[PDB]
Amino acid sequence: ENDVPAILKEIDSLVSREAVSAKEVSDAAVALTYLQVKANRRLWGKVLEKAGAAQDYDAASLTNLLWAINTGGVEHFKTVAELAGPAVSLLPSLSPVQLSIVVEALGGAGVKNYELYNKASAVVVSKIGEFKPAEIARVLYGVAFGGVNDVALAKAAGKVFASTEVDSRTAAQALYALAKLGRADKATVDALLKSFKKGTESASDAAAASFALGSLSFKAE
Amino acid sequence: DRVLSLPAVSKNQVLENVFHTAPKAPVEHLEKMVSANSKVYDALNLQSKRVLIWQVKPALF
Numbered sequence: 001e002n003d004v005p006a007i008l009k010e011i012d013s014l015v016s017r018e019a020v021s022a023k024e025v026s027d028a029a030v031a032l033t034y035l036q037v038k039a040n041r042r043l044w045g046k047v048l049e050k051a052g053a054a055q056d057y058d059a060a061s062l063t064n065l066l067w068a069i070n071t072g073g074v075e076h077f078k079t080v081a082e083l084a085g086p087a088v089s090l091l092p093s094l095s096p097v098q099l100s101i102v103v104e105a106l107g108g109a110g111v112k113n114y115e116l117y118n119k120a121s122a123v124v125v126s127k128i129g130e131f132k133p134a135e136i137a138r139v140l141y142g143v144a145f146g147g148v149n150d151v152a153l154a155k156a157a158g159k160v161f162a163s164t165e166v167d168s169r170t171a172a173q174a175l176y177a178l179a180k181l182g183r184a185d186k187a188t189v190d191a192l193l194k195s196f197k198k199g200t201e202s203a204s205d206a207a208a209a210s211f212a213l214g215s216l217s218f219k220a221e
Numbered sequence: 222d223r224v225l226s227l228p229a230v231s232k233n234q235v236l237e238n239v240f241h242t243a244p245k246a247p248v249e250h251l252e253k254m255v256s257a258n259s260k261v262y263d264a265l266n267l268q269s270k271r272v273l274i275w276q277v278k279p280a281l282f
Contacts, residue, residue: 045282
Protein backbone atom coordinates (compact mmCIF):
# COMPACT_ATOMS: atom_id res chain seq x y z
CA GLU A 1 0.00 0.00 0.00
CA ASN A 2 3.16 2.13 0.04
CA ASP A 3 4.71 1.51 -3.38
CA VAL A 4 7.23 3.88 -4.97
CA PRO A 5 8.29 1.77 -8.03
CA ALA A 6 4.69 0.75 -8.67
CA ILE A 7 3.67 4.40 -8.70
CA LEU A 8 6.50 5.21 -11.09
CA LYS A 9 5.02 2.68 -13.51
CA GLU A 10 1.65 4.39 -13.20
CA ILE A 11 3.22 7.77 -13.90
CA ASP A 12 5.09 6.16 -16.80
CA SER A 13 1.78 5.00 -18.24
CA LEU A 14 0.25 8.43 -17.70
CA VAL A 15 2.80 10.25 -19.86
CA SER A 16 3.14 7.47 -22.44
CA ARG A 17 -0.36 7.86 -23.81
CA GLU A 18 -1.19 9.99 -26.80
CA ALA A 19 -2.92 13.18 -25.66
CA VAL A 20 -1.40 14.19 -22.31
CA SER A 21 -2.61 17.67 -21.43
CA ALA A 22 -0.70 20.40 -19.64
CA LYS A 23 -2.09 19.60 -16.20
CA GLU A 24 -1.25 15.92 -16.39
CA VAL A 25 2.32 16.54 -17.54
CA SER A 26 2.79 19.23 -14.90
CA ASP A 27 1.61 17.01 -12.07
CA ALA A 28 3.62 14.07 -13.31
CA ALA A 29 6.69 16.28 -13.03
CA VAL A 30 5.71 17.52 -9.57
CA ALA A 31 5.26 13.92 -8.46
CA LEU A 32 8.74 13.03 -9.71
CA THR A 33 10.55 15.61 -7.59
CA TYR A 34 8.69 14.87 -4.33
CA LEU A 35 9.56 11.23 -4.99
CA GLN A 36 13.20 12.18 -5.84
CA VAL A 37 13.57 10.19 -9.06
CA LYS A 38 17.06 11.17 -10.22
CA ALA A 39 17.89 7.53 -10.94
CA ASN A 40 15.28 7.05 -13.68
CA ARG A 41 16.24 9.38 -16.52
CA ARG A 42 13.93 7.97 -19.17
CA LEU A 43 10.86 8.67 -17.05
CA TRP A 44 12.04 12.25 -16.67
CA GLY A 45 12.55 12.32 -20.41
CA LYS A 46 9.02 11.16 -21.17
CA VAL A 47 7.71 14.05 -19.09
CA LEU A 48 9.73 16.68 -20.91
CA GLU A 49 8.72 15.14 -24.23
CA LYS A 50 5.09 15.79 -23.35
CA ALA A 51 5.98 19.13 -21.79
CA GLY A 52 6.95 20.45 -25.20
CA ALA A 53 3.98 18.82 -26.89
CA ALA A 54 1.43 20.35 -24.52
CA GLN A 55 -0.32 23.28 -26.16
CA ASP A 56 -2.69 24.48 -23.47
CA TYR A 57 -0.96 26.16 -20.50
CA ASP A 58 -2.62 28.07 -17.72
CA ALA A 59 -0.76 30.02 -15.08
CA ALA A 60 -0.91 27.20 -12.55
CA SER A 61 0.45 24.25 -14.51
CA LEU A 62 3.31 26.19 -16.08
CA THR A 63 4.68 27.19 -12.69
CA ASN A 64 4.20 23.74 -11.21
CA LEU A 65 6.12 22.33 -14.16
CA LEU A 66 8.91 24.89 -14.04
CA TRP A 67 9.24 24.47 -10.28
CA ALA A 68 9.63 20.73 -10.80
CA ILE A 69 12.21 21.19 -13.54
CA ASN A 70 14.30 23.56 -11.44
CA THR A 71 13.94 21.74 -8.11
CA GLY A 72 14.45 18.30 -9.60
CA GLY A 73 17.68 19.34 -11.26
CA VAL A 74 16.60 18.21 -14.71
CA GLU A 75 18.16 20.01 -17.63
CA HIS A 76 16.93 20.06 -21.20
CA PHE A 77 17.43 23.37 -22.94
CA LYS A 78 15.08 22.76 -25.85
CA THR A 79 12.11 21.92 -23.66
CA VAL A 80 12.59 24.63 -21.05
CA ALA A 81 13.38 27.43 -23.49
CA GLU A 82 10.19 26.75 -25.42
CA LEU A 83 8.24 27.01 -22.17
CA ALA A 84 9.06 30.71 -22.34
CA GLY A 85 6.37 30.91 -25.00
CA PRO A 86 3.59 30.17 -22.55
CA ALA A 87 5.31 32.46 -20.04
CA VAL A 88 5.28 35.62 -22.15
CA SER A 89 1.69 34.82 -23.13
CA LEU A 90 0.63 34.21 -19.51
CA LEU A 91 2.73 37.02 -18.05
CA PRO A 92 -0.06 39.39 -16.87
CA SER A 93 -2.01 36.28 -15.83
CA LEU A 94 0.68 35.23 -13.34
CA SER A 95 0.57 35.85 -9.62
CA PRO A 96 3.69 37.53 -8.19
CA VAL A 97 4.52 34.27 -6.44
CA GLN A 98 4.06 32.50 -9.78
CA LEU A 99 6.14 34.99 -11.76
CA SER A 100 9.01 34.44 -9.37
CA ILE A 101 8.99 30.71 -10.11
CA VAL A 102 8.99 30.98 -13.91
CA VAL A 103 11.78 33.54 -14.06
CA GLU A 104 13.88 31.61 -11.55
CA ALA A 105 13.36 28.49 -13.65
CA LEU A 106 13.79 30.02 -17.10
CA GLY A 107 16.65 32.18 -15.89
CA GLY A 108 18.46 29.39 -14.12
CA ALA A 109 18.32 27.25 -17.24
CA GLY A 110 19.92 29.95 -19.36
CA VAL A 111 16.99 30.78 -21.62
CA LYS A 112 17.98 33.76 -23.74
CA ASN A 113 14.62 35.54 -23.94
CA TYR A 114 15.04 39.30 -23.71
CA GLU A 115 11.32 39.90 -24.19
CA LEU A 116 10.55 37.80 -21.13
CA TYR A 117 12.99 39.36 -18.67
CA ASN A 118 12.20 42.89 -19.85
CA LYS A 119 8.51 42.49 -19.12
CA ALA A 120 9.15 40.36 -16.04
CA SER A 121 11.40 43.01 -14.52
CA ALA A 122 8.90 45.73 -15.38
CA VAL A 123 6.28 44.09 -13.17
CA VAL A 124 8.75 43.89 -10.31
CA VAL A 125 9.84 47.52 -10.58
CA SER A 126 6.23 48.65 -10.95
CA LYS A 127 4.62 46.47 -8.28
CA ILE A 128 7.45 46.18 -5.79
CA GLY A 129 5.39 46.09 -2.60
CA GLU A 130 3.37 43.26 -4.15
CA PHE A 131 6.47 41.05 -4.17
CA LYS A 132 7.80 39.29 -1.10
CA PRO A 133 11.61 39.64 -0.75
CA ALA A 134 11.99 35.93 -1.54
CA GLU A 135 10.23 36.64 -4.82
CA ILE A 136 12.51 39.55 -5.65
CA ALA A 137 15.59 37.34 -5.27
CA ARG A 138 14.00 34.76 -7.56
CA VAL A 139 13.42 37.30 -10.31
CA LEU A 140 16.90 38.70 -9.68
CA TYR A 141 18.38 35.23 -10.03
CA GLY A 142 16.46 34.80 -13.25
CA VAL A 143 17.25 38.05 -15.02
CA ALA A 144 20.93 37.74 -14.04
CA PHE A 145 21.36 34.18 -15.25
CA GLY A 146 19.27 34.82 -18.35
CA GLY A 147 21.98 37.14 -19.59
CA VAL A 148 20.28 40.46 -18.86
CA ASN A 149 22.34 43.07 -17.01
CA ASP A 150 19.24 44.76 -15.63
CA VAL A 151 20.56 47.09 -12.95
CA ALA A 152 17.20 48.85 -12.71
CA LEU A 153 16.09 45.67 -10.94
CA ALA A 154 19.34 45.27 -8.98
CA LYS A 155 18.85 48.70 -7.43
CA ALA A 156 15.18 48.07 -6.64
CA ALA A 157 16.14 44.73 -5.12
CA GLY A 158 18.68 46.37 -2.83
CA LYS A 159 16.09 48.80 -1.49
CA VAL A 160 14.09 45.81 -0.26
CA PHE A 161 17.05 43.91 1.19
CA ALA A 162 17.91 46.84 3.46
CA SER A 163 14.28 47.52 4.46
CA THR A 164 13.22 43.94 5.21
CA GLU A 165 15.62 41.43 6.70
CA VAL A 166 15.46 38.34 4.53
CA ASP A 167 15.84 34.60 4.89
CA SER A 168 19.26 32.98 4.61
CA ARG A 169 18.09 31.15 1.48
CA THR A 170 16.63 34.41 0.18
CA ALA A 171 19.86 36.34 0.72
CA ALA A 172 22.14 33.71 -0.78
CA GLN A 173 20.07 33.65 -3.94
CA ALA A 174 20.33 37.43 -4.05
CA LEU A 175 24.08 37.24 -3.51
CA TYR A 176 24.44 34.64 -6.26
CA ALA A 177 22.51 36.86 -8.65
CA LEU A 178 24.62 39.91 -7.83
CA ALA A 179 27.81 37.89 -8.15
CA LYS A 180 27.04 37.00 -11.76
CA LEU A 181 26.11 40.58 -12.54
CA GLY A 182 29.35 41.51 -10.78
CA ARG A 183 28.04 44.39 -8.72
CA ALA A 184 29.57 44.14 -5.21
CA ASP A 185 27.52 47.01 -3.77
CA LYS A 186 28.52 46.84 -0.11
CA ALA A 187 25.38 48.77 0.83
CA THR A 188 23.41 45.72 -0.38
CA VAL A 189 25.77 42.81 0.33
CA ASP A 190 26.13 43.77 3.99
CA ALA A 191 22.34 44.01 4.24
CA LEU A 192 22.28 40.37 3.08
CA LEU A 193 25.19 39.15 5.21
CA LYS A 194 23.24 39.82 8.40
CA SER A 195 20.78 37.11 7.39
CA PHE A 196 23.47 34.45 7.95
CA LYS A 197 23.46 34.45 11.75
CA LYS A 198 20.26 32.52 12.51
CA GLY A 199 21.83 29.38 11.05
CA THR A 200 21.32 27.92 7.60
CA GLU A 201 19.20 24.83 7.04
CA SER A 202 20.80 24.15 3.65
CA ALA A 203 24.44 23.76 2.78
CA SER A 204 23.64 24.76 -0.79
CA ASP A 205 22.99 28.38 0.13
CA ALA A 206 25.88 28.61 2.55
CA ALA A 207 28.04 27.34 -0.32
CA ALA A 208 26.41 29.75 -2.74
CA ALA A 209 26.89 32.78 -0.54
CA SER A 210 30.46 31.56 -0.13
CA PHE A 211 30.89 31.60 -3.90
CA ALA A 212 29.13 34.92 -4.29
CA LEU A 213 31.31 36.67 -1.73
CA GLY A 214 34.62 35.45 -3.11
CA SER A 215 33.58 36.30 -6.65
CA LEU A 216 33.19 39.86 -5.41
CA SER A 217 35.99 39.39 -2.79
CA PHE A 218 34.29 40.73 0.32
CA LYS A 219 35.43 38.30 3.05
CA ALA A 220 34.21 35.18 4.84
CA GLU A 221 31.79 36.16 7.56
CA ASP B 222 -23.17 -10.63 -104.41
CA ARG B 223 -24.81 -12.29 -101.44
CA VAL B 224 -21.95 -11.03 -99.28
CA LEU B 225 -23.19 -7.47 -99.79
CA SER B 226 -26.40 -8.35 -97.97
CA LEU B 227 -24.53 -9.57 -94.91
CA PRO B 228 -23.78 -6.97 -92.23
CA ALA B 229 -20.58 -5.26 -93.34
CA VAL B 230 -19.37 -4.65 -89.81
CA SER B 231 -17.35 -7.71 -88.86
CA LYS B 232 -17.73 -9.94 -85.85
CA ASN B 233 -14.27 -8.69 -84.94
CA GLN B 234 -15.35 -5.06 -85.12
CA VAL B 235 -18.26 -5.81 -82.82
CA LEU B 236 -16.03 -7.45 -80.24
CA GLU B 237 -13.53 -4.63 -80.35
CA ASN B 238 -16.25 -1.97 -80.02
CA VAL B 239 -18.25 -3.76 -77.35
CA PHE B 240 -15.31 -4.90 -75.24
CA HIS B 241 -13.25 -1.81 -75.86
CA THR B 242 -11.48 -1.50 -72.49
CA ALA B 243 -10.32 -4.28 -70.20
CA PRO B 244 -12.63 -3.86 -67.19
CA LYS B 245 -11.39 -3.08 -63.72
CA ALA B 246 -11.24 -6.07 -61.39
CA PRO B 247 -13.10 -5.86 -58.06
CA VAL B 248 -10.07 -7.05 -56.07
CA GLU B 249 -7.68 -4.66 -57.82
CA HIS B 250 -8.72 -1.86 -55.47
CA LEU B 251 -8.25 -4.04 -52.42
CA GLU B 252 -4.80 -5.40 -53.18
CA LYS B 253 -3.50 -1.98 -54.24
CA MET B 254 -4.75 -0.09 -51.21
CA VAL B 255 -3.79 -2.88 -48.82
CA SER B 256 -0.19 -2.89 -50.04
CA ALA B 257 -0.16 0.90 -49.67
CA ASN B 258 -1.72 0.83 -46.23
CA SER B 259 0.81 -1.79 -45.19
CA LYS B 260 3.26 1.10 -45.50
CA VAL B 261 0.94 3.26 -43.39
CA TYR B 262 0.93 0.47 -40.83
CA ASP B 263 4.70 0.07 -40.93
CA ALA B 264 5.66 3.67 -40.48
CA LEU B 265 2.93 4.92 -38.21
CA ASN B 266 1.61 2.32 -35.81
CA LEU B 267 3.75 2.13 -32.57
CA GLN B 268 3.65 -1.67 -32.69
CA SER B 269 5.35 -2.07 -36.05
CA LYS B 270 8.93 -3.21 -36.18
CA ARG B 271 9.86 -0.26 -38.41
CA VAL B 272 8.16 2.75 -36.87
CA LEU B 273 9.13 6.28 -37.72
CA ILE B 274 8.41 7.57 -34.22
CA TRP B 275 11.99 7.16 -33.02
CA GLN B 276 13.59 8.82 -36.00
CA VAL B 277 11.06 11.63 -36.26
CA LYS B 278 10.63 12.65 -32.63
CA PRO B 279 13.82 11.07 -31.34
CA ALA B 280 13.73 10.32 -27.54
CA LEU B 281 14.81 11.93 -24.30
CA PHE B 282 16.96 9.61 -22.26
